[PDB]
Design a protein around this ligand. Structure first.
Ligand SMILES: O=C(O)CCc1ccc2c(ccc3cc(C(=O)N4CCN[C@@H](C(=O)O)[C@H]4C(=O)O)ccc32)c1
Lengths: 279, 276
């Protein structure tokens, strides 16, 4: 039927949080049912579908969209990849599910970009993001385009800053600030947590990463010692958006409903509930 | 492929200056040394040709070059961004740039035009070329916490605040029933244009001006007797406006995305928006 939509998501707290079923075989509290294809091992395509329960910022958006746009859905978690890369000229992750028509739309912390926009249609953004900078409280830095980053050798002592390699951020820095990229390789971090330890332990002066993620981390940092730059200095501003199949008849209503939520204060209520920290 | 572009005076996004005696725009470079790209824009002074430049005009030029189309620019005749109003009843109509797009007087809106639900029901917006929000501008010395200040929430004739008539801020305060007390005050004092309002703040004829942070923060960095306060509270964004039948919808939005990703928007933001 034209009203029951197949929808794909991806576990990535706090935007999507996956829990197990009630020890009453149903999903309770503020969670919706979501299935997952669970592999038998790591050297096979064989698997089984398993019932889960999903919640979070993006899931609450999906609940809002369902009552407003008036559609029902069957939610499932992506297994072949994460958000979506073109690997061997084939899209995987959430983007792949939409491009190859296995899903009507993708709900999660999916960044809108030009490359993905040529194979899917994105909704309007429901959360701003971009490339931001996080420092210890006290460090004077504007943003990515600061000369202390582009020409770090012009200042003494030079800033020590890095990112997590093989991500969107490193790719963007490589194409835009070649020398900055070369300098950053000796300071790159294994992951977000190791970066934050590096900032606090004095081993690193600045960490360059996804804007929405750094704000979420700064809001709940123990001691409120890590802070991010002002939103007005985020580089290459964009948003998280809902991906739909190109030419989808749902894009217009999804957009109107998202823009209503921004205007309603509903989107702010969700930000306060899921993303706003104590700092 | 001769598109009719409508825009509005609104620094730093669109500057409007007279032409020289010979009907051309004076050559000019920025403080950083880049050429200032100026286009002829006709508008009210009868209609006269004027000189237009700024953030949004740089954007137009990038878009017309990427997708390879020609254009002619004019300033919106009523000077308004655009809301929907009832006629006389029964029928409704948009005013401002919104009205000129939907009536055919314009094929595309290139301006600091806010993306909202009311407008998006009738036109196609691009992806945001500028993310921002609403904030409050006050004379340096006026003390208010922000939009929840008691002097804003329990208004009176002693502390006067307002915004621009027929704008996104007017919509935002008119559509929400819970903002009825604030709107009932502002409708007594709203200004025809953002420039008059900002000047009225300096003149102490207006005490607080609610408007776009990308404009208000620019103004605060220029006129150091003015400050903003409270931070943001309606994180919106500016987008190109098009009719739903436009064959350019796709490439305009791809072009904007690419221009964020390659630092082009960073160049415009640093040239026109950021100061100290
Ligand atoms: O505190 C905790 O438990 C959680 C702490 C914590 C750490 C790291 C993370 C998150 C959330 C989301 C996320 C997403 C990407 C991530 O790949 N991209 C950004 C979103 N967009 C993704 C994409 O669209 O491809 C991608 C990107 O754009 O590069 C990386 C790290 C985190 C939360």
């Amino acid at each position: 039927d034209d009203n029951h939509l197949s929808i794909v998501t991806l576990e990535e707290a706090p935007f999507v949080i996956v829990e197990d079923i009630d020890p009453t075989e149903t999903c309770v509290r503020n969670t919706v049912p979501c299935r997952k294809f669970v592999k038998i091992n790591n050297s096979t395509n064989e698997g089984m579908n398993v019932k889960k329960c999903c919640k979070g910022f993006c899931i609450d958006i999906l609940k809002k969209l369902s009552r407003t746009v008036k559609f029902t859905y069957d939610l499932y978690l992506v297994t072949n990849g994460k958000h979506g890369k073109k690997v061997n000229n084939v899209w995987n992750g959430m983007i792949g599910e939409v491009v190859y028509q296995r899903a009507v739309m993708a709900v999660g912390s999916l960044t809108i970009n030009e490359e993905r926009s040529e194979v899917v249609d994105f909704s309007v953004p429901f959360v701003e993001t971009g490339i931001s900078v996080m420092v210890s409280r006290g460090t004077q830095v504007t943003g990515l385009s600061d000369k202390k980053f582009q020409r770090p050798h012009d200042y003494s002592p030079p800033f020590r800053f890095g990112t997590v390699p093989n991500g969107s951020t490193e790719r963007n820095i490589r194409n835009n600030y070649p020398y900055m990229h070369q300098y950053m390789t000796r300071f790159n971090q294994r992951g977000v947590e190791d970066a934050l330890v590096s900032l606090k332990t004095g081993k690193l002066d600045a960490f360059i990463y996804d804007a929405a993620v750094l704000n979420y981390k700064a809001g709940r940092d123990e001691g409120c010692k890590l802070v991010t730059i002002g939103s007005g200095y985020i580089f290459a501003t964009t948003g998280y958006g809902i991906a739909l199949q190109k030419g989808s008849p749902w894009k217009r209503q999804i957009d109107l409903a998202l823009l209503q939520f921004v205007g309603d204060g509903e989107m702010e209520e969700l930000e306060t509930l899921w993303l706003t920290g104590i700092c | 492929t001769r598109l009719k572009i409508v825009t509005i005076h609104q620094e730093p996004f669109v500057y409007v200056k007279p032409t020289m005696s010979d009907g051309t725009c004076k050559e000019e470079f920025t403080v950083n040394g880049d050429p200032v790209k100026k286009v002829i824009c006709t508008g009210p002074n009868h209609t006269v040709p004027q000189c237009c430049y700024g953030f949004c005009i740089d954007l137009l030029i990038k878009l017309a070059r990427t997708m390879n189309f020609t254009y002619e620019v004019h300033l919106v005749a009523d000077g308004k961004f655009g809301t929907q109003e009832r006629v006389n009843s029964n029928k409704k109509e948009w005013n401002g740039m919104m009205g000129e797009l939907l009536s055919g007087q314009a094929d595309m809106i290139v301006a600091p035009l806010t993306i909202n639900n009311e407008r998006a029901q009738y036109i196609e917006f691009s992806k945001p070329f500028k993310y921002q929000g609403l904030t409050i501008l006050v004379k340096k010395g006026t003390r208010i916490t922000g939009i929840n200040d008691p002097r804003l929430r329990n208004p009176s004739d002693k502390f006067i605040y307002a915004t621009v008539k027929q704008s996104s801020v007017d919509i935002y305060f008119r559509r929400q029933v819970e903002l009825s007390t604030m709107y009932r005050h502002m409708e007594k004092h709203n200004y025809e244009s953002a420039a008059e309002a900002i000047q009225a703040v300096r003149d102490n004829k207006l005490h607080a001006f609610i408007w776009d942070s990308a404009v208000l923060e620019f103004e605060a960095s220029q006129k150091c007797d003015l400050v903003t306060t409270g931070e943001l509270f309606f994180r919106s964004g500016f987008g190109i406006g098009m009719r739903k039948d436009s064959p350019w919808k796709q490439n305009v939005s791809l072009s904007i995305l690419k221009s964020h990703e390659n630092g082009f928007m960073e160049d415009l933001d640093k040239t026109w928006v950021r100061y100290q």
